[PDB]
Ligand binder design. Structure first.
Ligand SMILES: NC(=O)C1=CN([C@@H]2O[C@H](COP(=O)(O)OP(=O)(O)OC[C@H]3O[C@@H](n4cnc5c(N)ncnc54)[C@H](OP(=O)(O)O)[C@@H]3O)[C@@H](O)[C@H]2O)C=CC1
Ligand SMILES: NC(=O)C1=CN([C@@H]2O[C@H](COP(=O)(O)OP(=O)(O)OC[C@H]3O[C@@H](n4cnc5c(N)ncnc54)[C@H](OP(=O)(O)O)[C@@H]3O)[C@@H](O)[C@H]2O)C=CC1
Ligand SMILES: O=c1ccn([C@H]2C[C@H](O)[C@@H](COP(=O)(O)O)O2)c(=O)[nH]1
Ligand SMILES: O=c1ccn([C@H]2C[C@H](O)[C@@H](COP(=O)(O)O)O2)c(=O)[nH]1
Ligand SMILES: CCc1nc(N)nc(N)c1-c1ccc(Cl)cc1
Ligand SMILES: CCc1nc(N)nc(N)c1-c1ccc(Cl)cc1
Lengths: 560, 558
């Protein structure tokens, strides 16, 4: 009895085709993935001819170009009542060592044919579309695994993958007892022989979530879902390992005792291959809750903290705007352009609807800072003032500072353009002489740039204090966005943002909300495009209308 | 023999194990726990009708054992002796219920046969636990598959020594003495074949732990494995479902790996607990995976961007051991930093010349500082630490009260509000960079206190020569953390190293590959002397520190 899997690419609304074609421009990595999965013999992936079978409906077969069909090096089965096997053979000369294309009247007939006629030759069976055959395979319950390429952008479609148990992997579902009726869905039998019985309901659970890819401006990732019941929950010589085991046992005794005391928090534990880069962020939250120390802090709330943490995010395919909770993109962008301008007037942010600075520039708060001479909204000689005018004497948010202090951002960009191997391309906001004049001591206080041999730019930012629940996603996007902007005006390609964290903490009053967020599987990351690239020559040329975020499909509000 | 035999011992770097029929060092608590856990645990519990292990010892070791511990409880005890009588031992202290009668045997082979014969169903593992006479017999018989060695990092006077053995280079540097065939015990690989030229074994490390200490004594744990000397010059459905996808995702890295000869430090060590493995693994990862480019001086640099390491400070001090670190230089330069001094002649006159090449008239002129006196580093590291933002005239000026004194600010906050999240000290002053002989390399450090009065430090370094600078930099900021912890009545916990451009020079690669053949030795202890006299960071002098148990490998021939 041979394994059956489904292989499909779909939009978040399950769109898979239009006018008997695909909805999107060509997805190059997905095509490699489709070929490799369906052509790979089982012994190869784990490292007389044996081959796999691909089963498709008639429209999917018709949708292919004559030169491309049948799919090479796999047995092709077409489910159809009208197509004839002789016609297919008559299309073009049969190639050597290629299986004759078979036509069957239903999916059960196709599987029975493979089980019986191809018992010694076929290894694996892939159902590869379209919606008619996917629906048949789901309702039959024969698919142990679904290989889904989640395309993050929406496209006009007229053919959709059937709704299925587990399709919350694609998009947000009204499920908090607020749905008007049980969601539309195929019934998937867990034991296929027992059909539709209440006791026999299955669901598909993700075991695999890759990092985000893109081609042709389309972001997407790869997931593998495994059928489950709905009522469900180095290497060394053995002698070497046995000699070592008693020493490890006593060395781990103190940790094992404290593990067995508390319950260990773990983000979406059923996902075994955790390639998505947001798993760094989810695992960080879990590790702070599990292993941080509870302590007191400036605000009085109480925190769990760890000291010295790192994450890295790729910028060459997609943009790390986190998906298990929506990030305030407009605030990230408006605040970064404000920084770049050297602006210290937080009212300019507030009037645009970005309120993040307001609580720290009230008359009340500025007086707690012993700055009663500060007009409301004046953050003092803080972040952007130090970036563009490091060391200048500060009067107020209305003063013109052109030519005062050191313009670090200009110096970094000039060095990247002329001497990109330089090891001093740094920008800092931490000016200890100015700390008492500021509304807040800088939090993200240092960044460093680096170029490799292929004109790829990377950025490290060092943050002294990190609220992982609320601040960290925002800071990831700010400095990733900065890296895209610097790369563009320096004729570089953005490669990586690297995040160095000092005091890294969650607030104890957020612990329960974070546990709920840690039940969410990350979605594919969006793409951030720079618009009007020919117009933008210098870092000061960017405006708030020069950016577009594409394919951003985050989880909704936290039910807590 | 169906039953495994292992040797368990603690020894100084000179193989010393005993004096006056006792141990040569103050009590080592963690080693005593380790000894009990290893010899007591039966592999049902290690891997996770009574079964037990046996411990076999010589008569003097039996006599040395404090009577409250003797016989070793929950283990069968066998004493090898020509004079002790089993009846006398039993009458001296009769055994509790469910404990084993102590046996007496005339030789190690007699003891091992008794165990294979009479204790077939009950004994699991056999440990030889001393002393030198029984260790020598076991080594020469070749019955011990593994050696559990506690490496005590300090020499102590001893009158009894572990025998010289093949593999004892794991302990200390071996001079040009050849002497070994006459000196070392010959260890049969196949014990049945005895001493034949084709039957020669050696012991190789598979396990090196992090460094522990008790009572001022640093030490670590290694397990050695017997080898031939001629060796030397989830559910399957889930996993199978995932495999084709991983196969294509890894195809690019796989085809580059197949073309590269991967560098790997001492790859026979499988458990790599020693914290110096982070440094050795970093060298390897830079050579395997760094990008080769050219730098300021036109030579090749292999570089990576954004690396980290972490070193514990609560038991030992991370003075690296695969190559000697210039401790005097580390300590003098830090004291100089703490003074805000910028006169590199003050270092040079103490035999610390690390700054000289960057304060010569010729070099200073290349910095467009022709008005700088020889030896004047400008407003650099310690000046920014103690006088941040102050305007700089020369290295003779008195800058008292000028600028921001970050170091004093950090100490006062640690003393008064330790959970503050702003305890930072920076040397990166962009307004002063052009006046400095060198732009600062280690430019920012941040402190943190947990709920147990334990202090940690992060230092951020923009440019890291892993071959030469980084071991020095690690010692500098670990030492600074020890000093800050003391004057704040805190305990030092951890030094965390954040690295930007992390590189090795291509013309060091050959010498580095040699270094990567060296197994790390236990870290030494750094003690602060005269603690009662030292109340403020400025109070420390060079005489206030001692380095205990520092046993680094010697110089690289390449
Ligand atoms: N994004 C992706 O991964 C994929 C996208 N697509 C897109 O999907 C669309 C085509 O899919 P679709 O339109 O659903 O058509 P199908 O490929 O499902 O072919 C439908 C035909 O196949 C036969 N058939 C299908 N289901 C059954 C069944 N249960 N029992 C018996 N015969 C059956 C019938 O053939 P007859 O009428 O001859 O009896 C039916 O008319 C195209 O736009 C294509 O581009 C296709 C594959 C994968
Ligand atoms: N640091 C460590 O890990 C350890 C240290 N020690 C230290 O080692 C010292 C004792 O070791 P050591 O002095 O060598 O004495 P031993 O413990 O080796 O006992 C020596 C006696 O044991 C018997 N014996 C030993 N080897 C043989 C043999 N091959 N064949 C027959 N009988 C044998 C003889 O007993 P008889 O004379 O009765 O025939 C011999 O006189 C003490 O200082 C002790 O503290 C001990 C154990 C571990
Ligand atoms: O960009 C920022 C700015 C602030 N914070 C958080 C860290 C702390 O929780 C708090 C700042 O207060 P202090 O670290 O100064 O105490 O806000 C961030 O996470 N990111
Ligand atoms: O404390 C120090 C000072 C310097 N370097 C190394 C790093 C670089 O190889 C070189 C300084 O060169 P630049 O990065 O400034 O170009 O010295 C260190 O590793 N540690
Ligand atoms: C490469 C497109 C693709 N990607 C994935 N992940 N699955 C598929 N089933 C297909 C596909 C679509 C149309 C045809 Cl005709 C064949 C295959
Ligand atoms: C705990 C000391 C110790 N540590 C180790 N690692 N091995 C040993 N063989 C011993 C030891 C020393 C003397 C006696 Cl009598 C028994 C055991």
């Amino acid at each position: 009895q041979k394994p059956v899997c489904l292989v499909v690419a779909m939009t978040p609304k399950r769109g898979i085709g239009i006018n008997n074609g695909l909805p999107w421009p060509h997805l190059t990595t997905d095509f490699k993935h489709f070929s490799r999965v369906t052509k790979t013999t089982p012994e190869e992936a784990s490292r007389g001819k044996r081959f796999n079978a691909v089963v498709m409906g008639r429209k999917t077969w018709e949708s292919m170009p004559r030169k491309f069909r049948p799919l090479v090096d796999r047995l092709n089965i077409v489910v159809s009542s009208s197509l004839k096997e002789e016609d297919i053979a008559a299309e073009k000369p049969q190639a050597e060592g290629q299986q004759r294309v078979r036509v069957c009247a239903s999916l059960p007939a196709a599987l029975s044919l493979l089980e019986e006629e191809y018992k010694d030759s076929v290894d694996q069976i892939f159902v590869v579309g379209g919606a008619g055959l996917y629906e048949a395979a789901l309702s039959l319950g024969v698919a142990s695994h679904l290989y889904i390429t989640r395309v993050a952008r929406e496209f006009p479609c007229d053919v959709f993958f059937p709704a299925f148990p587990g399709d919350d992997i694609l998009s947000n579902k009204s499920t908090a007892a607020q749905a008007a009726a049980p969601a539309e869905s195929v019934f998937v039998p867990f034991c296929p022989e027992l059909g539709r019985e209440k006791d026999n309901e299955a669901t598909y659970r993700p075991i695999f979530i890759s990092k985000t890819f893109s081609d042709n401006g389309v972001p997407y990732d790869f997931v593998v879902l495994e059928k489950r019941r709905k009522t469900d929950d180095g290497l060394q010589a053995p002698s070497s390992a046995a000699a070592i085991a008693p020493v490890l046992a006593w060395m781990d005794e103190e940790d094992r005792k404290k593990r067995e005391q508390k319950e260990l928090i773990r983000a979406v534990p059923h996902v075994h291959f955790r390639g998505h880069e947001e798993f760094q962020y989810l695992d960080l939250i879990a590790d702070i809750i599990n292993n941080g120390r509870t302590m007191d802090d400036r605000t009085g709330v109480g925190v769990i903290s760890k000291f010295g943490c790192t994450m890295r995010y790729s910028l060459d395919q997609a943009f790390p705007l986190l998906t298990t909770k929506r990030v305030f993109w407009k605030g990230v962008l408006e605040e970064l352009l404000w920084f770049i301008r050297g602006d210290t007037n937080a009212n300019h942010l507030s009037e645009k609807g970005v309120k993040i600075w307001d609580k720290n520039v009230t008359r009340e708060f500025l007086d707690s800072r012993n700055l009663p001479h500060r007009e409301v909204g004046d953050i003092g000689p803080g972040y952007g003032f130090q970036w563009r005018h490091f060391g200048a004497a500060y009067k107020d948010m209305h003063t013109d500072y052109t030519g005062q202090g050191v313009d670090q951002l200009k110096n970094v960009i000039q060095m990247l353009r002329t001497n990109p191997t330089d090891r001093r391309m740094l920008m800092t906001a931490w000016n200890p002489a100015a700390l008492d004049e500021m509304a807040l001591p800088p939090c993200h206080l240092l960044c460093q740039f680096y170029v490799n041999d292929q004109k790829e730019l990377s950025c490290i930012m060092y943050q002294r204090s990190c609220d992982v629940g609320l601040g960290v996603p925002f800071n990831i996007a700010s400095y990733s966005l900065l890296t895209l902007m610097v790369a563009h005006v320096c004729n570089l390609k953005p490669k990586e943002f690297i995040h160095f964290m000092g005091n890294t903490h969650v607030y104890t009053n957020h612990v329960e909300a974070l546990k709920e967020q840690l039940r969410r599987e990350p979605r594919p990351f969006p793409i951030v495009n720079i618009l009007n690239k020919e117009r933008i020559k210098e870092i000061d040329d960017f405006t708030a209308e020069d950016f577009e975020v594409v394919g951003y499909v985050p989880h909704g509000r936290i039910q807590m």
